Short mmCIF file of C-alpha atoms in Angstrom, two decimals:
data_model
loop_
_atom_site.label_atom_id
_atom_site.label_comp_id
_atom_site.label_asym_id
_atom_site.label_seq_id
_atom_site.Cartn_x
_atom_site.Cartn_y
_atom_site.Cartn_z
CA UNK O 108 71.57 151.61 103.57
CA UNK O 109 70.99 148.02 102.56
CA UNK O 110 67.58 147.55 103.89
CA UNK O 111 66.75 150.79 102.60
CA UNK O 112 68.14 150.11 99.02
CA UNK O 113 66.55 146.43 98.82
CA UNK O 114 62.93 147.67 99.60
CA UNK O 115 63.14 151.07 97.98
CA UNK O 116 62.27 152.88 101.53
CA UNK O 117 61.01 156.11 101.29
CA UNK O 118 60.76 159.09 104.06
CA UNK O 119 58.31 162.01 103.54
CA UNK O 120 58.61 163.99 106.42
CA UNK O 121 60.31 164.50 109.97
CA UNK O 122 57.95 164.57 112.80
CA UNK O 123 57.14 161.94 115.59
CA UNK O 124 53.95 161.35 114.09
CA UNK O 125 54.47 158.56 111.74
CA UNK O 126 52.22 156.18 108.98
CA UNK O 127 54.26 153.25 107.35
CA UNK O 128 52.19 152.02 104.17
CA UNK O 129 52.04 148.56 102.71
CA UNK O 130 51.51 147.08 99.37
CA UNK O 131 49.38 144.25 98.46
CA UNK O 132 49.94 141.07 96.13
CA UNK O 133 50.92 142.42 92.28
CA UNK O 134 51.47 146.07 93.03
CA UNK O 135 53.77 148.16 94.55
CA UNK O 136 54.25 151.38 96.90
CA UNK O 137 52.89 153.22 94.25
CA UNK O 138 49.20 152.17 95.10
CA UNK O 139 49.55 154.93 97.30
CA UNK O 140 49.72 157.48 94.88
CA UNK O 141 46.90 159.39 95.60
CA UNK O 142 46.63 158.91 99.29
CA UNK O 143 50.06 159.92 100.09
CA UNK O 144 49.34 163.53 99.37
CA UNK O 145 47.04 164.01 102.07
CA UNK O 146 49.56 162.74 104.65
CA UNK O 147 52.78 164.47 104.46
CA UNK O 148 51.80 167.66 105.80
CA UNK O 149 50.67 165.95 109.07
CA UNK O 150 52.53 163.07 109.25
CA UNK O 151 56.18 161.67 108.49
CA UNK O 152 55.23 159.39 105.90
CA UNK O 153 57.53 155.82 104.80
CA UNK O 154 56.48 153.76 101.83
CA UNK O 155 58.14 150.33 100.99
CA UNK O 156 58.04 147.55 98.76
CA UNK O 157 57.44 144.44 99.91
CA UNK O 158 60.46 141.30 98.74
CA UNK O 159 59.27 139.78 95.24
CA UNK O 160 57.58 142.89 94.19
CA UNK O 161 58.89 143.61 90.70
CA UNK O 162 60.80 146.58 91.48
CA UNK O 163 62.84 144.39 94.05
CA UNK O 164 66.16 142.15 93.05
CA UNK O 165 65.17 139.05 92.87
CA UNK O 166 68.14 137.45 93.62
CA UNK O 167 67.36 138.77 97.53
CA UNK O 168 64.08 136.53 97.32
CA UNK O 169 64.26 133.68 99.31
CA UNK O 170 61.93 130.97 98.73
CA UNK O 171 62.40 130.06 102.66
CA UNK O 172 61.98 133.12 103.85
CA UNK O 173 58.48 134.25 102.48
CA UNK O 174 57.08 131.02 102.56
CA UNK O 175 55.00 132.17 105.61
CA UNK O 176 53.71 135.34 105.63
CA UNK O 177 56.06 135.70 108.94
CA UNK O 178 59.12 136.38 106.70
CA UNK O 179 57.36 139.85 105.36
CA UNK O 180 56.21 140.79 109.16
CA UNK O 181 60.18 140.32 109.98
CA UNK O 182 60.91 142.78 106.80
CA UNK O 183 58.49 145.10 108.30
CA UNK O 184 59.68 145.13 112.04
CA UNK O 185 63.56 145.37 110.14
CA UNK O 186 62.49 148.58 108.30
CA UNK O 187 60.53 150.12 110.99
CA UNK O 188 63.94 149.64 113.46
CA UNK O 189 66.36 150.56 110.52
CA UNK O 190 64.43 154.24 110.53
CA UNK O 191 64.35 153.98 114.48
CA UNK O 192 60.30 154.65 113.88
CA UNK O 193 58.82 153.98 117.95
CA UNK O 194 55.47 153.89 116.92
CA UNK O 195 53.78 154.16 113.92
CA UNK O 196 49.98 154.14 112.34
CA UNK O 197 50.11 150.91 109.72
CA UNK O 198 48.08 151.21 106.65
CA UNK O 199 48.03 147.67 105.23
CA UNK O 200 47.05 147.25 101.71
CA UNK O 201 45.55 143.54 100.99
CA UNK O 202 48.46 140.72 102.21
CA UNK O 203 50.15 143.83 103.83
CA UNK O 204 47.68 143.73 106.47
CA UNK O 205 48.07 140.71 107.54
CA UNK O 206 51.24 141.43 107.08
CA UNK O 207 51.18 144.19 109.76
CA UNK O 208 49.04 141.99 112.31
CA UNK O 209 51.64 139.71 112.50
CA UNK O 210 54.07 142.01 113.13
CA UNK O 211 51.83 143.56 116.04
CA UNK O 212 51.72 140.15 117.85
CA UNK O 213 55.55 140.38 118.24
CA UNK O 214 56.00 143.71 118.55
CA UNK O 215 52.83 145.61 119.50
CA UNK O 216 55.13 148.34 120.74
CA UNK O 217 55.42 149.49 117.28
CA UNK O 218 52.41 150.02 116.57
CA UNK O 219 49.24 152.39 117.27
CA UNK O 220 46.65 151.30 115.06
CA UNK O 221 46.08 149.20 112.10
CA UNK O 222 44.19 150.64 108.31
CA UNK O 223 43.15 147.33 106.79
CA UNK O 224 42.34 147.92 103.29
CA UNK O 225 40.84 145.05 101.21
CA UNK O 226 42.29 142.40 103.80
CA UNK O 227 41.67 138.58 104.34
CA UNK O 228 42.54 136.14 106.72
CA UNK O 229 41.50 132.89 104.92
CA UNK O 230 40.64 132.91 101.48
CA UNK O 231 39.73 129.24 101.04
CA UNK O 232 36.22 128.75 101.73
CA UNK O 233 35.54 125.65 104.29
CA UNK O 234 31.89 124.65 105.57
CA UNK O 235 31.48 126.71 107.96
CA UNK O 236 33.72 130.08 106.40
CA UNK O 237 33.17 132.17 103.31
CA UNK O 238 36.42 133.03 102.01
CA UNK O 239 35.91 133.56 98.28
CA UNK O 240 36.95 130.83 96.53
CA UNK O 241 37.54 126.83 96.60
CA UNK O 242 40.68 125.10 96.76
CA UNK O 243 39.67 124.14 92.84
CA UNK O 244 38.94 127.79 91.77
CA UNK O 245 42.70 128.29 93.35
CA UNK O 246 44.25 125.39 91.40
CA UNK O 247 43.31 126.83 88.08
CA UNK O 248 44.40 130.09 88.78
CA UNK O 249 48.07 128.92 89.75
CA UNK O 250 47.78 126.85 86.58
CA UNK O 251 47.13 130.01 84.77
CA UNK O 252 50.31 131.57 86.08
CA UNK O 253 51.90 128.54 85.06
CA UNK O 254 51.24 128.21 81.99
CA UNK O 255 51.34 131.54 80.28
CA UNK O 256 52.16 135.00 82.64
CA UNK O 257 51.86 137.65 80.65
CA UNK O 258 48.00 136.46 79.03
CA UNK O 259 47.35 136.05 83.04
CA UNK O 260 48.00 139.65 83.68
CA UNK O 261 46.41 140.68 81.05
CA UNK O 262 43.19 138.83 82.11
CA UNK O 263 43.43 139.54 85.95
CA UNK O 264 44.59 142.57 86.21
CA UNK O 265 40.30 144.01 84.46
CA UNK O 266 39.41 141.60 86.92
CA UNK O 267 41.24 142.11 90.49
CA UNK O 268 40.87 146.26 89.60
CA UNK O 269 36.89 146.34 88.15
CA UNK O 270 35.77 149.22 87.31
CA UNK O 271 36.33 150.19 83.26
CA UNK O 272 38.65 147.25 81.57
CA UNK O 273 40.60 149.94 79.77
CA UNK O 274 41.30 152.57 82.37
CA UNK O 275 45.02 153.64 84.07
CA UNK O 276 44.71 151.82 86.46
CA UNK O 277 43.63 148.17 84.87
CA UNK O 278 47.00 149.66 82.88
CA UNK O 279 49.02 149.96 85.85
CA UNK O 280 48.09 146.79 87.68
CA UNK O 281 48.81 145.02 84.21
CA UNK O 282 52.53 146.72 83.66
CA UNK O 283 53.12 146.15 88.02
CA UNK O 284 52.21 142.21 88.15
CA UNK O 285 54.03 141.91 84.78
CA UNK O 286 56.90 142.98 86.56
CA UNK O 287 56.97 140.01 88.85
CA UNK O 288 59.37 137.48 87.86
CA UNK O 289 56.64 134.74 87.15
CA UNK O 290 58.18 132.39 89.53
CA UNK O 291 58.29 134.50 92.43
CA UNK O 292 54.45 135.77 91.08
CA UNK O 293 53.43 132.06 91.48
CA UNK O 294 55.22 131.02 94.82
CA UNK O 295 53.67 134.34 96.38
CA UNK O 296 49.95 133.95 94.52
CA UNK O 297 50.07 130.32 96.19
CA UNK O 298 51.73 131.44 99.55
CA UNK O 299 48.90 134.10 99.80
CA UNK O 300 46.08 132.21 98.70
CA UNK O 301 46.26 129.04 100.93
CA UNK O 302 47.47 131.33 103.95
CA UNK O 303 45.33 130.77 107.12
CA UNK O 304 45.66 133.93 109.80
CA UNK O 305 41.99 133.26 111.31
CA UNK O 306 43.62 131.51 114.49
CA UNK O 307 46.19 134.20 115.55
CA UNK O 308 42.99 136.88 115.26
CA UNK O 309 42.10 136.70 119.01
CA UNK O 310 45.37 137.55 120.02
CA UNK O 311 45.69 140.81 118.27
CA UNK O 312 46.02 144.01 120.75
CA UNK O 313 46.71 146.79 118.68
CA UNK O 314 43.45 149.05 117.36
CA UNK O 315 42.20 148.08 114.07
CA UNK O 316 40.05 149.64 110.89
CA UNK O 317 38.87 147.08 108.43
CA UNK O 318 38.06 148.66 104.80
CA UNK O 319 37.06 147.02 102.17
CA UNK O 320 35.09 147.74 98.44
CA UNK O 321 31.68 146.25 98.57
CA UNK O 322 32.31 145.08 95.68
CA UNK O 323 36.26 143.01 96.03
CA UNK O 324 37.22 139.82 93.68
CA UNK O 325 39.45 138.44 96.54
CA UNK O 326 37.45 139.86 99.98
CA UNK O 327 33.51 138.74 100.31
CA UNK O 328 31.94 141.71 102.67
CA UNK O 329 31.45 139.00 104.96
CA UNK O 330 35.29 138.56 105.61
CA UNK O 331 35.11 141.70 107.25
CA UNK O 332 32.21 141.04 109.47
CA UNK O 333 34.92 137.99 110.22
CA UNK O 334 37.32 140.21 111.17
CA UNK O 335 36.05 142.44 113.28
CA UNK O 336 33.91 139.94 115.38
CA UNK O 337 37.09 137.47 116.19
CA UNK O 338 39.90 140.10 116.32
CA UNK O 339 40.91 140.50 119.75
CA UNK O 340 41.63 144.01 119.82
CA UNK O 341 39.02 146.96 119.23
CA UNK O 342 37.81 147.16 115.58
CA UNK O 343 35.50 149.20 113.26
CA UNK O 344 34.49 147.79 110.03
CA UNK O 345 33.46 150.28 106.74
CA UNK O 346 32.53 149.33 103.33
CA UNK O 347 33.48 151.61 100.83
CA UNK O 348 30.45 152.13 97.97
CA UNK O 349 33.42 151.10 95.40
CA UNK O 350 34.36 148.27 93.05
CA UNK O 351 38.02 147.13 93.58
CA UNK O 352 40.66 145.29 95.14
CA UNK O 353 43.23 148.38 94.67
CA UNK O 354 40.10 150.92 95.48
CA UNK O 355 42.64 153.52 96.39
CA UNK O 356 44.40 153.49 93.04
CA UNK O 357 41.66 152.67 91.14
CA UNK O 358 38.63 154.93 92.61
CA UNK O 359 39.78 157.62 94.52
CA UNK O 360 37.21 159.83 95.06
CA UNK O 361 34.98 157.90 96.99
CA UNK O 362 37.96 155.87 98.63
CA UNK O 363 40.52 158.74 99.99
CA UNK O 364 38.25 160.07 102.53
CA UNK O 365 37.27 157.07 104.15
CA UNK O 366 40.79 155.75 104.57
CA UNK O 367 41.98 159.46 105.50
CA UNK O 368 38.89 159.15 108.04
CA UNK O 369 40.45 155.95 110.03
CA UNK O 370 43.92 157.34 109.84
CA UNK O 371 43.22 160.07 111.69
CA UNK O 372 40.28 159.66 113.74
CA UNK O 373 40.08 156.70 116.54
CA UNK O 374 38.30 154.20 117.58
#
């Protein structure tokens, strides 16, 4: 199947009862690694990678396409009707949940409930918002990327992960963004960064569960106090005691059950 093939789709299960999970920024569906084994005897489980990830083609990346983050919320409503999935829980990893909320303004139908993990409407910090970082902080980053990619991944990837600079999964992050080609790595790092989802917030309908680490290079806490009071919808906010913007990869232990909590409990 062709949108199967181009995002690597994969199906772990029959029943009604359904979770789609999506990657963040640098990774791939392979973040999921060690939450994915506590879903498939319950639920009929679909992991994807997201266009521009390094296990895509990147001749199938259009610059057009994914220069909103609507382009990715279209992929995601494409998959969901190629596997004729009615309704589905959405665990959205980083971009992937904003990802998802877009994709619940169109089609809400689709959707159940939203697991934010390490999510962000506005990075960019204005006067009166706390986002993480200024427009300047952003500049030399993508000038970074520029200038010399693999040195960039190697510095990031300690950074965006925390924890121990040496362990598998500071490894994996490194070998996953070094995947990117470093064009598409720098259109998307920009096309993330200066994205702006904090005025479509109110609109949201569909149930949502904001995670985050406490302690998150890209997500102050406060972006999730921003979340949950301007989303639209009913919310619940938890912050994980963990270091890490890939906290399910990264620090299991203490991560698993809280997600695994949201999934199956609601609001």
């Amino acid at each position: 199947g062709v949108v199967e093939e181009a995002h690597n789709v994969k199906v772990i299960g029959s029943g009604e009862a359904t979770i789609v999970l999506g990657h963040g920024f640098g990774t791939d569906q392979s973040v999921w690694k060690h939450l994915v084994p506590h879903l498939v005897d319950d639920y009929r489980v679909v992991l994807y990678d997201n266009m521009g990830a390094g296990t895509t083609n990147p001749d199938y990346f259009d610059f057009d396409r994914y220069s909103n983050l609507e382009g990715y919320s279209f992929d995601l409503i494409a998959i969901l009707e190629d596997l004729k999935i009615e309704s589905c829980i959405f665990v959205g990893h980083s971009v992937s949940a904003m990802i998802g909320v877009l994709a619940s303004l169109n089609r809400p139908d689709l959707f159940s409930k939203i697991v934010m993990i390490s999510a962000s409407p506005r990075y960019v910090n204005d006067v009166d918002y706390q986002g993480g970082f200024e427009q300047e902080d952003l500049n030399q980053l993508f000038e970074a990327i520029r200038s010399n990619y693999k040195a960039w991944c190697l510095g990031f990837a300690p950074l965006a992960v925390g924890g121990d600079m040496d362990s598998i999964a500071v490894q994996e992050f490194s070998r996953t963004l070094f995947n990117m080609r470093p064009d598409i790595a720098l259109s998307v790092g920009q096309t993330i960064f200066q994205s702006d989802m904090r005025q479509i917030l109110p609109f949201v309908t569909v149930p949502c569960h904001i995670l985050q680490s406490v302690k998150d290079l890209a997500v102050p806490v406060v972006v999730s106090e921003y979340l949950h009071a301007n989303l639209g919808c009913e919310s619940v906010v938890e912050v994980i005691p963990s270091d890490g913007h890939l906290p399910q990869l990264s620090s299991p232990d203490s991560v698993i059950p809280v997600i695994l909590r949201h999934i199956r409990n609601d609001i």
